[PDB]
Design a protein around this ligand. Structure first.
Ligand SMILES: Nc1ncnc2c1ncn2[C@@H]1O[C@H](COP(=O)(O)OP(=O)(O)OP(=O)(O)O)[C@@H](O)[C@H]1O
Ligand SMILES: [Mg+2]
Lengths: 52, 340, 115, 269, 52, 115, 86
């Protein structure tokens, strides 16, 4: 029973660590959207002014 | 095609906050390649601190021959007035080809590869201007308007070899004039070591005098240790299991080899390079897998940037080092590995 | 480099070092393709001494402290002769290869092996 | 670059070719030492077989468990001309056959190259010995042989075999599997009881067959090493010949280029 | 020894809950840092109103 | 061939292919003298993938049909990345080396292996 | 090339032999005198025949000096004689 309890402790640490990696990867994925949407808006306004 | 321009352009980009003025001289390049370098300087915010001198592939051989001297003269303006400047000659081998054309058309007798007799003096007359001048020279040049300040011009000439052949006349001349060289290797570049610097062949003749206190102490002997690791890795490749001294040297050399890898347009400050050097030379990477060294470095830097920002700001003032900073870095790396 | 100009002890030490390094030059290419284990018991021992001799030729200079980081060492003629004779006769076969790299006289090599 | 680098490569490959040529004769010499050791151990095994035959026929009162219904030999070093690969290829055929029958398999390992094979594919090894000299001693085999004999007495193994190479001739090593455990007018004066004697002689017989299999595999190894070093010597010769043709091209081109520069410079002066 | 094993299992279980909470807490702290740096990059990328 | 132009998935697949082919080129002289059987278990697996990558790079063209007889193939960038990524990951370690030669897309290598 | 073709013979000295302690450094395997035995006294002409044979045997067997324990006795005899003559 104590060996199974030790295995359960290790299992939840591996699960939490796997979710931690996924949380950070979703943040990296989100950062690229924030930066590229700013680029397209800024370049579009630059063309708006250039045509005028 | 192994990153010679990428290394020199990233070195120019890193000076935007250093107080060093920059000059980029393009000799015999196509105009669209020059325009792309200028776009990259502007996107990274470095163009406002750089002078770009262009002598493209369609221009007269006289303009391509004179461009390095014109750029040198623009850099010397800062040196003579007690200021610091940096100059990049993207291809001295193309300047030598332009000089060879003019000389053959003037009917001057040829040398070692149809090159003029004075092709050594072409480059030595250019490269001896890049120098550091004393306070007395600046005080005399400015008629006392500037005092107690030295001036300098640093140069980063580029040379192209054919299939690694250094015995060619022009490469032989330039390696014998500069204060050091950085050799880029195609086999290392294809193997994914992208800065591709051969540590065994590359050397700096100024050494530790050109480093801040923290980097000077944390990097002492790394170059020669990597040079000996490359030999050890080849000698012990097919032999049976060796002693602890051999395993310790081999396992450490593999980690420093993976650590020296960096991406383009991503420079590191004194504090970021210092944390990376400290974690390797103080033994903290011994438990880390080779395939995880890049992830460990990126996470360690990001953690010190959030939880130890005041220490990084102290290291970045002058690159100073003492027992307080040493213990501060130690405590932070231990807490990082024990909790993240 | 003549016994009639210097002495037989110096000359024999110099030719002894050269003999060991010359034989190692042909074995370097053998070890790289077929491995160290295929050499003879005399060759394996000689290769280890040659790699140690090759390292004991090194010395940190006072004018090179800016490049090396370590301090500079001056070594004398008698100290040089005694150190190379010791490696040739086998008095240091038990010391590790890295102990002879950048260490002035022979004493410091015995001390570096402990660090 | 030019002729200088090619000349250095030729000397390097030539230095290697000289030792692989010598190593072929050294392998032949060691092959003869192994062949004399194979013959020296035969009288003992044939005589133990002659005793067990009479001592079992004459005594129908007792049947030893070994008279009613794998040990793998491999090398510890490099330069083997397919010796170990041809043996494992032949073994896998019989292990697969035992799984078509649905039977479980126990494996024993002699030599460092055999241990690495099962470790790379997940094979269950019950016992293992390694790093034996080119001239092995029977006292080292006792351990590995006993674990396999006990598994038979415990009813865990129905049949046991020794997997090794046989010396057909100096140019042919054959991979084989041989069964170990499952094998006229006067009688002996048995000092101890005949049952006690049969139990000890059957054990000596199986150990002797394993020792003979190990010594014959070492003779096959030296014969395989001779062919491998002969092939290495011949392969290096082809590389030297190709580099010499490339060197001569660079030699002729350097003379032609130097003459072109001297004539070009003297036309201008 | 059985009573002590249940007390030990009670400590190992709760320590694993606490460590798993801290591993996810540090991941959420890292994710927040990534998005804030991305907001400053996207805000600085606005140089195009003058650089272009 | 830049992460900012083609995206990280294409860039890493291309870099992975070049790393495998470079390491295979370094082993050519050792393989020529001693054969493949002397290589490490890691190098053996890499050489096997290098041989498959080298064959999967081949492609029958619609202008080359007169030379051999085989019909031409057009392969999209998506199919190209998927095939090489799978070979690098080891998803095709069981298929024979000749199944990758002259087949256009990666699915055709799976059908060619059935013969 | 010109002078090798003009002369009656050549004595070749080698750097590898000179660094291996063979002080005169004369490579006897490629060195030659076209005049030969006509330029020798009766005693040296008689004794030199077995010595040339010993150095030739040593050049063919030199690779086995590191593995001399595995040689055939008849071959070991040529090798040990070749080493002492060398
Ligand atoms: N640190 C790096 N990490 C990844 N890729 C890099 C790195 N440094 C350079 N490269 C890439 O490798 C190539 C190097 O091209 P670069 O123009 O800098 O080399 P070059 O030697 O100057 O080439 P050329 O001879 O055409 O002038 C480019 O594709 C570049 O993006
Ligand atoms: Mg370039």
């Amino acid at each position: 029973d104590l060996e199974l309890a030790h295995e359960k402790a290790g299992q939840q640490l591996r699960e939490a660590k796997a979710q931690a990696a996924e949380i950070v990867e979703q943040a990296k994925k989100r950062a690229n959207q924030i930066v590229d949407e700013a680029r397209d808006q800024a370049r579009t306004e630059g063309e708006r002014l250039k045509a005028q | 095609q192994i990153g010679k321009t990428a290394l020199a352009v990233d070195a120019i980009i890193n000076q935007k906050d250093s107080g060093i003025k920059c000059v980029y001289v393009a000799i015999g390049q196509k105009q669209s390649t020059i325009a792309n370098v200028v776009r990259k300087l502007e996107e990274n915010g470095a163009l406002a601190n750089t002078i770009v001198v262009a002598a493209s592939a369609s221009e007269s051989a006289a303009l391509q021959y004179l461009a390095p001297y014109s750029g040198c003269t623009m850099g010397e303006y800062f040196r003579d007035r007690g200021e610091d400047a940096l100059i990049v000659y993207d291809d001295l081998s193309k300047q030598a080809v332009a000089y060879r054309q003019i000389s053959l058309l003037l009917r001057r007798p040829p040398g070692r590869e149809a090159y003029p007799g004075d092709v050594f003096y072409l480059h030595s007359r250019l490269l001896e201007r890049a120098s550091r001048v004393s306070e007395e020279y600046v005080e005399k040049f400015t008629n006392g308007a500037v005092t107690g300040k030295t001036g300098s011009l640093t140069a980063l000439p580029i040379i192209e070899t054919q299939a690694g052949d250094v015995s060619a006349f022009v490469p032989t001349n330039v390696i014998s004039i500069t204060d050091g060289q950085i050799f880029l290797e195609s086999a290392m570049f294809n193997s994914g070591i992208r800065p591709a610097v051969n540590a065994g062949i590359s050397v700096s003749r100024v050494g530790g005098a050109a480093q801040t206190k923290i980097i000077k102490k944390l990097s002492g002997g790394i170059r020669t240790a990597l040079a000996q690791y490359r030999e050890l890795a080849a000698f012990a490749q097919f032999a049976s299991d060796l002693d602890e001294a051999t395993r310790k040297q081999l396992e450490h050399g593999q980690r420093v080899t993976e650590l020296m890898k960096q991406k383009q347009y991503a420079p590191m400050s004194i504090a970021e390079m210092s944390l990376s050097l400290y974690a390797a030379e103080r033994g903290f990477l011994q438990d880390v897998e080779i395939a995880k060294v890049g992830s460990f470095e990126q996470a360690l830097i990001s953690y010190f940037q959030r939880e130890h920002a005041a220490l990084l700001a102290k290291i970045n003032e002058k690159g100073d080092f003492n027992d307080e900073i040493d213990a501060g870095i130690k405590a932070g790396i231990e807490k990082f590995k024990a909790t993240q | 480099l003549d016994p009639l100009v210097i002495g037989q002890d110096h000359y024999d030490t110099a030719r002894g070092v050269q003999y060991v390094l010359q034989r190692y030059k042909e074995l370097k290419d053998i070890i790289a393709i077929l491995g160290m284990d295929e050499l003879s018991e005399a060759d394996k021992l000689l290769v280890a001494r040659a790699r140690k001799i090759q390292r004991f030729l090194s010395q940190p200079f006072f004018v090179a402290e800016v490049f090396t980081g370590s301090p500079g060492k001056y070594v004398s003629l008698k100290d040089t002769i005694a150190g190379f004779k010791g490696i040739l006769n086998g008095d240091y076969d038990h010391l590790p290869e890295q102990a002879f790299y950048m260490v002035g006289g022979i004493e410091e090599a015995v001390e570096k092996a402990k660090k | 670059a030019g002729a200088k680098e090619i000349r250095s490569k030729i000397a390097s490959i030539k230095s290697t070719q000289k030792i692989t040529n010598a190593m072929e004769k050294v392998a032949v010499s060691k092959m003869r030492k192994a062949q004399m050791r194979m013959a020296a151990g035969r009288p003992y095994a044939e005589r133990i077989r002659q005793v067990i035959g009479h001592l079992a026929n004459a005594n129908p009162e007792y049947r030893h468990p070994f008279m009613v219904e794998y040990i793998v030999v491999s090398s510890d070093r490099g330069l083997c001309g397919g010796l170990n690969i041809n043996l494992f290829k032949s073994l896998v055929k019989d292990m697969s056959g035992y799984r078509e029958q649905g039977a479980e398999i126990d494996l024993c390992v002699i030599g460092s190259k055999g241990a690495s094979f099962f470790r790379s594919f997940g094979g269950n090894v019950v016992a293992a010995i390694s790093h034996l000299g080119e001239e092995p001693s029977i006292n080292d085999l006792i351990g590995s042989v006993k674990v396999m004999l006990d598994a038979y007495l415990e009813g865990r193994i129905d049949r046991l075999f020794v997997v090794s190479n046989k010396f057909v001739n100096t140019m042919t090593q054959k991979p084989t599997v041989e069964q170990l455990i499952p094998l006229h007018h006067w009688d002996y004066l048995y000092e101890p009881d005949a049952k006690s004697l049969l139990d000890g002689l059957l054990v000596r017989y199986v150990e002797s067959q394993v020792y003979q299999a190990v010594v014959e595999n070492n003779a096959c190894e030296q014969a395989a090493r001779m062919i491998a070093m002969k092939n290495a010597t011949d392969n290096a010769g082809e590389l030297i010949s190709d580099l010499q043709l490339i060197y001569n091209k660079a030699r002729q081109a350097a003379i032609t280029q130097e003459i072109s520069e001297i004539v070009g410079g003297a036309a201008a002066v």
